[PDB]
Each structure stands twice: as structure tokens, then as C-alpha cells.
């Protein structure tokens, strides 16, 4: 008898849901592409490890 | 109670579209009224200009990118040795084709002549680490000789 | 339960008539489609007949004059007679069937003798 | 926890996340700059600081007769923040708080 | 758990009786939830197929059949995220489509419906050296576009009509 | 009325992440994939890298 309340909360909550995913991929998926550095780790000195 | 929530969550949205509009107006200021240095600000690709065209309830963009086409392999030298002398390429990279040495800059390959207008000299050949030997050419002794 | 049991398949010399006969626990009815697959070996799976809900009857080209795929509404299953069987008609006949979801049953190796 | 509430998994799995930022890290590390507009290109690092040291009002001769220095110092600079982060338990103060 | 002599309920989350005590045997046993989720569809466009492939939600693929029929055990391959119902599993990887979750994807390919681990890109290496460098020869300029929105349509609504209608009374009230 | 509290402080909570996120973009973008000239914005003094 109180209408769709329930409805307009889910639909929140997964557009919270949803938000969540998208803000990880943008921050993240910025390279079209895998890199790998090559076995070698001369860097002039430099150290990465 | 069905009016107090539709009122918090069209604020909400609101909050929201504003912050949007305030993106869109900074990209407006920089991107077009100008040149950008911010990478991926203005669209993927080094920025070159930008036009702004109207739309229902926003702006669309198009904007102009520069991209490097294809590229070609070099065998590269930190400096040049040429009298006990080091010599530094006053902007770009010192490359060779095998066989001599050119100077060219970053992003558009087209070699060049060593000689004492690109470079400056700066210390001996005993530090720098890599330093190749080679003869770098003076655009005055011909002009002497004659 | 097996919601898509086959039965009929063995061995029979060319030329002989044979029927067939997979049943479905589930109403043959809202199923929407009936359809007969047979691979041969060394070779890919291949459509044989198909009966949709409608009741529309289609029939491979090397199917046509001989086989006649039908379903009885008495005990839930659909029907498939073979005759005048010739050697390269010999596979592995498996019926097939898609309400929302892939179904399909095991069995029925024909071979024929020749 | 069991009246109705459930927790959905991220899309994003860590592992897939850590390779994310391993493959920027090598792409920084052996292509400069250049991979973040086109195709990647190789150069060398000791070529390539100089650059940076170009982008700052340094000239690349500085870089160039210093080298053993810089790399010391980096490598020290590492070090320091890896004991650092193991060493205050506050650091993370806010990923603990959200 | 060890009750003590005196005890008989069990609530270690304070809203929820845990564990009981049955009187005519004095052992205690545990309650526990009849496990519940929620009811998800996967979905091609809707004029491009009917095949649909239905998920539920952090359960085990034991309870699903006693949970529209589940129609026996075909295809029910399990995932982290639940059971999935209708896809198979393919061991080659493509980008996403439909994101379902914890690294799954699925789409529909020419038993519809697809499901694979995530492919997170193409892979390459680096030719790297210590003196070779790479320089473009050539160029080329590229337009792309980007959208973004500015206003939302400005909207205001009354007060007292939408809450009390032409009425006298019901404004009275409301006051 | 519970239920109401929780969803609104959610999505206030959700806005303000996405705020975060949207900077963490920003300086992943420029601070990482170049090199910025903005002062204080990837640390403090020059930035290199
Ligand atoms: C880069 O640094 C790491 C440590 O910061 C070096 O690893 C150490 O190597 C020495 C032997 O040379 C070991 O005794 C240490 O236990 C190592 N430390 C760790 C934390 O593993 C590494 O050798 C350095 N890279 C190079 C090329 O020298
Ligand atoms: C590398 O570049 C040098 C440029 O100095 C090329 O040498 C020239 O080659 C052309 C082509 O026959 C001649 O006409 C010029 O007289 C050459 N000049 C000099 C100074 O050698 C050389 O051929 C190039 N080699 C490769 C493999 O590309
Ligand atoms: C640089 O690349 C452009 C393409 O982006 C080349 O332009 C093409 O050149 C070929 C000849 O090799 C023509 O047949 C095409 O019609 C050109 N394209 C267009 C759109 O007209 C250009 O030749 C390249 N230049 C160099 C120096 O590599
Ligand atoms: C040409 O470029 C490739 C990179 O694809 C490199 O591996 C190779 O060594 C280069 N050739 C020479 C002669 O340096
Ligand atoms: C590059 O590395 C090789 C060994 O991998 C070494 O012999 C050479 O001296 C190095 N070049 C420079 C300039 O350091
Ligand atoms: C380069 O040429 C100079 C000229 O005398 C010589 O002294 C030196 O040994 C050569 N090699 C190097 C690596 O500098
Ligand atoms: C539906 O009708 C078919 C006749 O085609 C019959 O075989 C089947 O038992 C019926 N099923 C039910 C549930 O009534
Ligand atoms: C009640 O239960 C106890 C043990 O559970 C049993 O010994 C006793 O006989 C029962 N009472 C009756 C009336 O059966
Ligand atoms: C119908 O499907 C076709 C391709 O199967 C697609 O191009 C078209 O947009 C679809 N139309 C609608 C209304 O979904
Ligand atoms: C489902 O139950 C089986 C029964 O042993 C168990 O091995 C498996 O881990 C369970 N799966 C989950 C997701 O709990
Ligand atoms: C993927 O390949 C492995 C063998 O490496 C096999 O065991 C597995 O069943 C394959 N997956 C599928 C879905 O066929």
C-alpha cells in the first residue's frame, strides 16, 4: 500500500553498484595495451626492483 | 514524505550535473581559447585546437590531435667526442643510419649536418658514459679559405 | 530425470525402414522447436529435420522422399521414420531442442549395412 | 548479514589490477612519455631524464656528469619510503577510514 | 558452542537467536538462514535473439534445482559470483560485453550465449636496448569527440495542489 | 525511515568518492603518462616523474 519505494531503492543502490565499476576502469584503464619490461635490468644504475 | 524524497534526490542530481558543467566550462577556457600542455585534457594525442558545437542540454567537442605515424629504428649516442671536447646536441638526439651521425629533433625525423650551430661544448670526454667519437663540422674554416 | 531421452538407433542392413523416437519429459508443445541431429564420423554435425511450434516442416536436401519427422500429442516425443536407408546415412542421430536454452541427448549410433 | 544485504564482487579483480600497473610501469620505464600519445617508442633512460631535465630549466650536460650520483640517490630515496610505509601504521589513514 | 548450565538461546549478532536449546534433549543446535539471493538475466538485444541466461546471486550450484523451471542439470557451470545457467564456458578470452563480474564476461555468438574470462588487451613487448631510440618519419591528425552534459531541464512544482487538491479541509491540516 | 537514512547517506558518500576518483584520473593522466608543469599538483618542488 506504500507505492514503490522499494523499486526507487534498488534503483540506487545498483546505480551506486554501477558508479563503483566505472570510476575503477576510468582510473585504471588508461593504456590500449600490455607492456612487459625486458629480462635485462641494466638502467644505467638505476633499480626498479 | 514521497515529496521530501523526490526533492533530496533531485538535489542530489543536481549537485551533481553542476559539478559536470564546472569540467565543461574549464575545458571550454583552456582547451579552445587556447593550447593546452595537460596530456589526455583535450582529447588522446599531443592538442592542437579544438571547436565547441551546440547540443540539447550540453556541448559536444571535436577536437584536432596530432599522432605520430610510422617510426624507424637508429642506433643513438648520449654525446659527441670530436677534440677532448663533449658536445650537446642543442635540442634532439644525436642518430645515425649505420655509417654517419646526424642531429634531427623528437617527433619528425630530418637529419641534419653536425655542426657548431647545434651544439654547445661543456667539459671533457672522460665522464659521460657511452660518448662516441666523430668529427664534428665547422661552418667557418671554409669561409676562411676562401 | 533425463528431461530429453532418444531411443530407436542400432544396426540395420541398407534399404530397411527404422523410427527414430526421442520423448521429453517436459510439454513438447512450449518447447517451440523440435529439430534431428546426425554426425557423421570424420565429418561435422549436420541438421536433419526441423518442426517448429507453428508446425512448419523443413527437411534436408539428402532428408526429402524418405524421412518424415512428426510428433504424436498423445505421449510427449516427436517421431522420425527412416527408409530406404543407404550407407552414408550411418551417424550418430541426436534430437534437439531449445525453449530458452539448449538441450540435447546422447545415444541412437545407426549403422548401416552395405 | 543475512537479512537482505549482499556484497557484490568488483568487477576488477586485483590481479588484472596489478598488471594494469605493471604495464604502465613499464611503458614509463622504457618508452618515456611517448606511449601515452601513440605508438610506443623505445629510448633509452639515461637519454631519457635528461628530458625531464630539459622540462625543468636544467641543461642535459648536468645529468650527463652526475649519473652515479643520481642513481645513488634514487635508489636510497626507494629505500627510505619501502622502510617508511612499514614503518607507520597511520599512513593509510584514509582507505582504512572509507 | 559450549552453552553454559543456565543458558538456553544463542545471539552473538544481538537481533537473531544463533543457536537454540531443545528441551527433551538437552543438546543445542545452531540456526541457520534457508539461504536466499536475488534473480539476475542475461541478455542479447531483444530483437537480435530470445536466448537468455539467468544468474543467481553467491550460491552454490547444489541448491539452485529446489530454489520458470531449472529443467535438470544442462550447463550449469559455477562461477564466484553464483551459478550461471545457460552459457558455456569457453577457455578463449575477448574483451567484455556484458560484465557479470569478478573478472567473467559474456556474449552472444553464433547454447547462445558465451561466457569467458576477461581479455584484458592485446599483449606486445618493447624491443628495449641501451642506445636505440625510435623516431616517426610520417604523421597523421585525428578528430575524435566527447559529450558533456550542462543543464537538466528546470522544473518546479506546486505545493499545496499536489498535496492537498483544491481542498479546503485537507489545507487546514496541512498548516 | 531507516532504510531512508542509510540510501542517503550512501549516495552522499558515493558522490564524494566519485569526486576523489575523478582527481586520482586527473593525476594519473598528466602527473604519470608526462611530464606536468603545474607547481604542488603531482609533489612538492620540480616534478620529474
Ligand atoms: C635493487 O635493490 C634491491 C634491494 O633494494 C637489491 O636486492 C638486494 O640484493 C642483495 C645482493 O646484491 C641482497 O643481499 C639483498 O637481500 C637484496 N635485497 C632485497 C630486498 O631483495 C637488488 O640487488 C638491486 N638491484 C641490483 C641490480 O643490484
Ligand atoms: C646513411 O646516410 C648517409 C648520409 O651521409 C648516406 O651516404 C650518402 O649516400 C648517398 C646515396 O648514394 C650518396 O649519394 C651520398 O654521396 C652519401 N654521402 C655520404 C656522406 O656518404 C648512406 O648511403 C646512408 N646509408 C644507409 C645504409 O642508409
Ligand atoms: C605520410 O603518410 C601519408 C598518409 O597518412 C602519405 O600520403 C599518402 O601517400 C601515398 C603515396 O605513397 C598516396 O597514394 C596517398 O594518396 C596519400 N594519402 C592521401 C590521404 O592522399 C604520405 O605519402 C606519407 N609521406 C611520407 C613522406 O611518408
Ligand atoms: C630495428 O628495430 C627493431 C625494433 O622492432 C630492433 O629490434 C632492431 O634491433 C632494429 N635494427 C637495428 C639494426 O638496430
Ligand atoms: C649497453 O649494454 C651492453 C651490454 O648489454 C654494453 O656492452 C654496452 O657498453 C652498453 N652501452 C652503454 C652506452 O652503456
Ligand atoms: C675515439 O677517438 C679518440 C681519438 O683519439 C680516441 O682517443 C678514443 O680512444 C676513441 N674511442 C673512444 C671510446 O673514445
Ligand atoms: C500435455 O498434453 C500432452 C499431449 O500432447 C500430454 O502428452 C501431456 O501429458 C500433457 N501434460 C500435462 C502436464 O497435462
Ligand atoms: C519425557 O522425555 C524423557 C526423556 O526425553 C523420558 O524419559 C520420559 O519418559 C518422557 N515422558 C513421558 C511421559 O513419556
Ligand atoms: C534489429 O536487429 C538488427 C540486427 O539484428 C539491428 O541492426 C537493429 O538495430 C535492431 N532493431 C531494433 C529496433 O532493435
Ligand atoms: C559448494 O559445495 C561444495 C561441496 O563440497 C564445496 O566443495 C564448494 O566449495 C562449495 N562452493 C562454494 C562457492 O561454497
Ligand atoms: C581449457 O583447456 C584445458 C586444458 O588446458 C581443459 O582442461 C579445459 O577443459 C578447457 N576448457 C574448456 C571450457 O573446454
Not at chain 3, 527404422?18 to 518447447?31: H, K, P, T
Given at each position: 500500500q506504500?507505492?514503490?519505494?522499494?523499486?526507487?531503492?534498488?534503483?540506487?543502490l545498483?546505480?551506486?553498484?554501477?558508479?563503483?565499476?566505472?570510476?575503477?576502469?576510468?582510473?585504471?584503464?588508461?593504456?590500449?595495451?600490455?607492456?612487459?619490461?625486458?629480462?635485462?635490468?641494466?638502467?644505467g644504475?638505476?633499480n626498479?626492483? | 514524505?514521497?515529496?521530501?524524497?523526490?526533492?533530496?534526490?533531485?538535489?542530489?542530481?543536481?549537485?551533481?550535473?553542476?559539478?559536470?558543467?564546472?569540467l565543461?566550462?574549464?575545458?571550454?577556457?583552456?582547451?579552445?581559447?587556447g593550447?593546452?600542455?595537460?596530456?589526455?585534457?583535450?582529447?588522446?594525442?599531443?592538442?592542437?585546437?579544438?571547436?565547441?558545437?551546440?547540443?540539447?542540454?550540453?556541448?559536444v567537442?571535436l577536437?584536432?590531435?596530432?599522432?605520430?605515424?610510422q617510426?624507424?629504428?637508429?642506433?643513438?649516442?648520449?654525446?659527441?667526442?670530436?677534440?677532448?671536447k663533449?658536445?650537446?646536441?642543442?635540442?634532439?638526439?644525436?642518430?645515425?643510419?649505420?655509417?654517419?651521425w646526424?642531429?634531427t629533433?623528437?617527433?619528425?625525423?630530418?637529419?641534419?649536418?653536425?655542426?657548431?650551430?647545434?651544439?654547445?661544448?661543456?667539459?671533457?670526454?672522460?665522464?659521460?658514459?657511452?660518448?662516441?667519437?666523430?668529427?664534428?663540422?665547422?661552418?667557418?674554416?671554409?669561409?676562411?679559405?676562401? | 530425470?533425463?528431461?530429453?531421452?532418444?531411443?530407436?538407433?542400432?544396426l540395420?542392413?541398407?534399404?530397411?525402414?527404422?523410427?527414430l523416437?526421442?520423448?521429453?519429459?517436459?510439454?513438447?508443445?512450449?518447447?517451440?522447436?523440435?529439430?534431428?541431429?546426425?554426425?557423421?564420423?570424420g565429418?561435422?554435425?549436420?541438421?536433419?529435420?526441423?518442426?517448429?511450434?507453428?508446425?512448419?516442416?523443413?527437411?534436408?536436401?539428402?532428408?526429402?522422399?524418405?524421412?518424415?519427422?512428426?510428433?504424436?500429442?498423445?505421449?510427449?516425443?516427436?517421431?522420425?521414420?527412416?527408409?530406404?536407408?543407404?550407407?552414408?546415412?550411418?551417424?550418430?542421430?541426436?534430437?534437439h531442442?531449445?525453449?530458452?536454452?539448449?538441450?540435447?541427448?546422447?545415444g541412437?549410433?545407426?549403422?548401416?549395412?552395405? | 548479514?543475512?537479512?537482505?544485504?549482499?556484497?557484490?564482487?568488483?568487477?576488477?579483480?586485483?590481479?588484472?589490477?596489478?598488471?594494469?600497473?605493471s604495464?604502465?610501469?613499464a611503458?614509463?620505464?622504457?618508452?618515456?612519455?611517448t606511449?601515452?600519445?601513440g605508438?610506443?617508442?623505445?629510448?633509452?633512460?639515461?637519454m631519457?631524464?635528461?628530458?625531464?631535465?630539459?622540462?625543468?630549466?636544467?641543461?642535459?650536460?648536468?645529468?650527463?656528469?652526475?649519473?652515479?650520483?643520481?642513481?645513488?640517490?634514487?635508489?636510497?630515496?626507494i629505500?627510505?619510503?619501502?622502510?617508511?610505509?612499514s614503518?607507520?601504521?597511520?599512513?593509510?589513514?584514509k582507505?582504512?577510514?572509507? | 558452542?559450549?552453552?553454559?548450565?543456565?543458558?538456553?538461546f544463542?545471539?552473538?549478532?544481538?537481533?537473531?537467536?544463533?543457536?537454540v536449546?531443545?528441551?527433551?534433549?538437552?543438546?543445542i543446535?545452531?540456526?541457520?538462514?534457508?539461504?536466499?539471493?536475488?534473480?539476475?538475466?542475461?541478455?542479447?538485444?531483444?530483437?537480435?535473439?530470445?536466448?537468455?541466461?539467468?544468474?543467481?546471486?553467491?550460491?552454490?550450484?547444489?541448491?539452485?534445482?529446489?530454489?520458470?523451471?531449472?529443467?535438470?542439470?544442462?550447463?550449469?557451470?559455477?562461477?564466484?559470483?553464483?551459478?550461471?545457467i545457460?552459457?558455456?564456458?569457453?577457455n578463449?578470452?575477448?574483451?567484455?560485453?556484458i560484465?557479470?563480474?569478478?573478472g567473467?564476461?559474456?556474449?552472444?555468438?553464433?547454447?547462445?550465449?558465451?561466457?569467458?574470462?576477461?581479455?584484458?588487451?592485446?599483449?606486445?613487448?618493447?624491443?628495449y636496448?641501451?642506445?636505440?631510440?625510435?623516431?616517426?618519419?610520417?604523421?597523421?591528425?585525428?578528430?575524435?569527440?566527447?559529450?558533456?552534459?550542462?543543464s537538466?531541464?528546470?522544473?518546479?512544482?506546486?505545493?499545496?495542489?499536489?498535496?492537498?487538491?483544491?481542498?479546503?479541509?485537507?489545507?487546514?491540516?496541512?498548516l
Amino acid at each position: 500500500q506504500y507505492g514503490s519505494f522499494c523499486t526507487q531503492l534498488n534503483r540506487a543502490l545498483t546505480g551506486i553498484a554501477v558508479e563503483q565499476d566505472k570510476n575503477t576502469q576510468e582510473v585504471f584503464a588508461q593504456v590500449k595495451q600490455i607492456y612487459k619490461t625486458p629480462p635485462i635490468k641494466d638502467f644505467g644504475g638505476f633499480n626498479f626492483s | 514524505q514521497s515529496l521530501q524524497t523526490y526533492v533530496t534526490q533531485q538535489l542530489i542530481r543536481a549537485a551533481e550535473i553542476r559539478a559536470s558543467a564546472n569540467l565543461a566550462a574549464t575545458k571550454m577556457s583552456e582547451c579552445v581559447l587556447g593550447q593546452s600542455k595537460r596530456v589526455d585534457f583535450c582529447g588522446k594525442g599531443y592538442h592542437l585546437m579544438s571547436f565547441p558545437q551546440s547540443a540539447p542540454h550540453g556541448v559536444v567537442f571535436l577536437h584536432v590531435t596530432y599522432v605520430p605515424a610510422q617510426e624507424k629504428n637508429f642506433t643513438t649516442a648520449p654525446a659527441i667526442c670530436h677534440d677532448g671536447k663533449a658536445h650537446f646536441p642543442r635540442e634532439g638526439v644525436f642518430v645515425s643510419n649505420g655509417t654517419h651521425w646526424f642531429v634531427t629533433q623528437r617527433n619528425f625525423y630530418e637529419p641534419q649536418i653536425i655542426t657548431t650551430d647545434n651544439t654547445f661544448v661543456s667539459g671533457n670526454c672522460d665522464v659521460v658514459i657511452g660518448i662516441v667519437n666523430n668529427t664534428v663540422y665547422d661552418p667557418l674554416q671554409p669561409e676562411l679559405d676562401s | 530425470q533425463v528431461q530429453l531421452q532418444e531411443s530407436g538407433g542400432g544396426l540395420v542392413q541398407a534399404g530397411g525402414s527404422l523410427r527414430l523416437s526421442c520423448a521429453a519429459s517436459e510439454s513438447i508443445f512450449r518447447m517451440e522447436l523440435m529439430e534431428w541431429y546426425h554426425q557423421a564420423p570424420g565429418k561435422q554435425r549436420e541438421l536433419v529435420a526441423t518442426i517448429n511450434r507453428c508446425g512448419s516442416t523443413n527437411y534436408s536436401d539428402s532428408v526429402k522422399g524418405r524421412f518424415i519427422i512428426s510428433s504424436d500429442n498423445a505421449k510427449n516425443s516427436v517421431y522420425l521414420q527412416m527408409n530406404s536407408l543407404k550407407d552414408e546415412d550411418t551417424a550418430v542421430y541426436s534430437c534437439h531442442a531449445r525453449t530458452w536454452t539448449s538441450y540435447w541427448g546422447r545415444g541412437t549410433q545407426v549403422t548401416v549395412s552395405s | 548479514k543475512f537479512n537482505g544485504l549482499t556484497v557484490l564482487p568488483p568487477l576488477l579483480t586485483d590481479e588484472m589490477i596489478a598488471q594494469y600497473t605493471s604495464a604502465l610501469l613499464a611503458g614509463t620505464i622504457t618508452s618515456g612519455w611517448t606511449f601515452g600519445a601513440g605508438p610506443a617508442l623505445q629510448i633509452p633512460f639515461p637519454m631519457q631524464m635528461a628530458y625531464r631535465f630539459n622540462g625543468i630549466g636544467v641543461t642535459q650536460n648536468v645529468l650527463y656528469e652526475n649519473q652515479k650520483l643520481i642513481a645513488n640517490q634514487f635508489n636510497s630515496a626507494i629505500g627510505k619510503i619501502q622502510d617508511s610505509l612499514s614503518s607507520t601504521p597511520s599512513a593509510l589513514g584514509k582507505l582504512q577510514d572509507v | 558452542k559450549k552453552f553454559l548450565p543456565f543458558q538456553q538461546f544463542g545471539r552473538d549478532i544481538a537481533d537473531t537467536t544463533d543457536a537454540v536449546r531443545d528441551p527433551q534433549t538437552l543438546e543445542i543446535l545452531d540456526i541457520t538462514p534457508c539461504s536466499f539471493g536475488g534473480v539476475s538475466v542475461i541478455t542479447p538485444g531483444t530483437n537480435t535473439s530470445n536466448q537468455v541466461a539467468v544468474l543467481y546471486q553467491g550460491v552454490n550450484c547444489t541448491e539452485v534445482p529446489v530454489a520458470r523451471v531449472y529443467s535438470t542439470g544442462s550447463n550449469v557451470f559455477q562461477t564466484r559470483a553464483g551459478c550461471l545457467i545457460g552459457a558455456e564456458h569457453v577457455n578463449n578470452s575477448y574483451e567484455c560485453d556484458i560484465p557479470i563480474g569478478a573478472g567473467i564476461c559474456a556474449s552472444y555468438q553464433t547454447q547462445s550465449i558465451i561466457a569467458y574470462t576477461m581479455s584484458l588487451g592485446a599483449e606486445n613487448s618493447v624491443a628495449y636496448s641501451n642506445n636505440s631510440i625510435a623516431i616517426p618519419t610520417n604523421f597523421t591528425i585525428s578528430v575524435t569527440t566527447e559529450i558533456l552534459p550542462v543543464s537538466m531541464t528546470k522544473t518546479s512544482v506546486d505545493c499545496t495542489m499536489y498535496i492537498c487538491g483544491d481542498s479546503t479541509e485537507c489545507s487546514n491540516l496541512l498548516l
